[PDB]
TrEMBL record, chains A, B:
Protein name per UniProt: GTPase
Origin superkingdom: Archaea
Family, as annotated: Belongs to the GPN-loop GTPase family.
Keyword terms, alphabetized: GTP-binding, Hydrolase, Metal-binding, Nucleotide-binding
Binding sites annotated in the UniProt record for Mg(2+): T25
Residues noted as binding GDP in the record, renumbered to the chain: G21, G23, K24, T25, T26, K180, D182, S232, T233
SUPFAM superfamilies assigned to the protein according to its UniProt record, in alphabetical order: P-loop containing nucleoside triphosphate hydrolases
UniProt GO MF annotations: GTP binding; GTPase activity; metal ion binding
A Pfam family assignment: ATP_bind_1
InterPro entries the UniProt entry points to: Gpn, P-loop_NTPase
Gene3D superfamilies: P-loop containing nucleotide triphosphate hydrolases
Amino acid sequence: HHLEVLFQGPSYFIFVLGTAGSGKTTLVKALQDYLLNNELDTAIINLDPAVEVLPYKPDIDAREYVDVYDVMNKYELGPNSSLVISVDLLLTKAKELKEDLNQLQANYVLVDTPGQIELFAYRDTGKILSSFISEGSKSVSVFLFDSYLSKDPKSFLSLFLLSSSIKFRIDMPQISVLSKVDLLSSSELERMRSWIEDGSIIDELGSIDEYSFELVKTIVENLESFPIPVSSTNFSGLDQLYAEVQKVLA
Amino acid sequence: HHLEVLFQGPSYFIFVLGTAGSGKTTLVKALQDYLLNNELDTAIINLDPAVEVLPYKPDIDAREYVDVYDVMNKYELGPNSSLVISVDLLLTKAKELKEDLNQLQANYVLVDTPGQIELFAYRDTGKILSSFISEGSKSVSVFLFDSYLSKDPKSFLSLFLLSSSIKFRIDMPQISVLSKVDLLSSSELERMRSWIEDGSIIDELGSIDEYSFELVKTIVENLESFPIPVSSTNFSGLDQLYAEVQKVLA
Ligand SMILES: Nc1nc2c(ncn2[C@@H]2O[C@H](COP(=O)(O)OP(=O)(O)NP(=O)(O)O)[C@@H](O)[C@H]2O)c(=O)[nH]1
Ligand SMILES: Nc1nc2c(ncn2[C@@H]2O[C@H](COP(=O)(O)OP(=O)(O)NP(=O)(O)O)[C@@H](O)[C@H]2O)c(=O)[nH]1
Ligand SMILES: [Cl-]
Ligand SMILES: [Cl-]
Ligand SMILES: [Mg+2]
Ligand SMILES: [Mg+2]
């Protein structure tokens, strides 16, 4: 017999990114339900070492590799630097991690990430880790535009800047999602869609210095499409999201 | 007698902002030492409800107003959303806070902030809170460019984007500081200074899509000055920083 030989198939990694509280962990659970309901084998990787309660069962869990509170004590750091270094420490255990990855056998692998967006936008950590965990496989990032933050036009545009910094750093395609869309009224959603798909957002800014205006002009001039509206609680928009994942990975 | 009548003088609020671990809390302590060594009356406000150990004695402390861990339990949130909501909860106690502010009597008030930069760049929380705590007084924000992150040109430019989003949202002038400069060699510092003061950074980018290039061009075209090099551990650059604070507040 040969016990090194395992059944092989395609694996697709889906990294769910977003600001604090934008709904990443809930969406991972909802997207896993959706994919399994459609007979698509799906596993979950939790990369947040600080989370306490999860609505899903992670197949790989960062909390078994690094103790955040032990880090904050052993290095005398602040609450946020401690979470950054903890994620950084994951890469020191690349040996143990690659073994867990090897023994993982799933067609779709959902990666829940911490709601510290500087790890993906302002540091190399997000790129190095995401490339390490998805090595040898196609990947896509899903970035969550929090609906609560997006209904304000100036706040919406800052999130497009943030998402662009992530896309530039991470080495994979990115899908934009408008998360928690149930928090919006019909008129708010339509107004936001017109802001983007028609460029009218530039008028909702009013008093803006010349510098910020030039950034905004560049953003709006390169807005390809409106973020996919998703509501994990209402379990809506997951088919659009999964249709775009398939279009991107193909 | 009239016991409502207190001695009045000018107060200047200095908000120290920056990415996780950029050195905010250490710089606050160093800047307080510097100002007191020069016979300048200085108090400290700690706005980070999650910090465990501080090198200074805060005159107002957010931890006495909100319990972060109690928030994460009572609302079933993640580790980062819990810290955002905790800061948000501070404004619910505006009554108690304004009383502490009133009873504060200091010429310079240093405000240590949490290393969750979305509170200042991607949410209104930072603006509302900073305006509330400094009401009736001149204020300045000090944003920390972490030297470790700034030595990579693409990482430096993303931090200029981030600092611009903060400056646009916060309603006060902002001073840029290159923190932890002791981590850099002489050649690295000079190279970074040439990147900015001469615009040569645009060549250190190499393979860049057209969209990211247009953002970078706008950033570099509006780089007024190089961030002030500060090293709290070497206690250097604090006089330059304090000379610029005075120039801005005047
Ligand atoms: N080399 C060097 N290290 C510094 C300097 N200032 C702070 N540090 C170190 O960098 C780490 C972060 O310092 P700290 O003041 O807590 O930064 P913070 O930005 O408040 N962290 P947080 O975002 O978690 O609140 C600590 O190890 C501190 O000793 C500096 O000027 N040089
Ligand atoms: N209305 C609404 N609330 C949602 C939705 N998805 C999540 N939430 C709620 O929003 C809060 C944040 O959800 P959570 O999945 O933990 O988000 P997270 O982005 O992983 N948080 P963190 O950044 O701290 O890890 C929770 O109260 C969750 O119930 C949604 O689609 N609609
Ligand atoms: Cl890092
Ligand atoms: Cl908010
Ligand atoms: Mg989460
Ligand atoms: Mg701190």
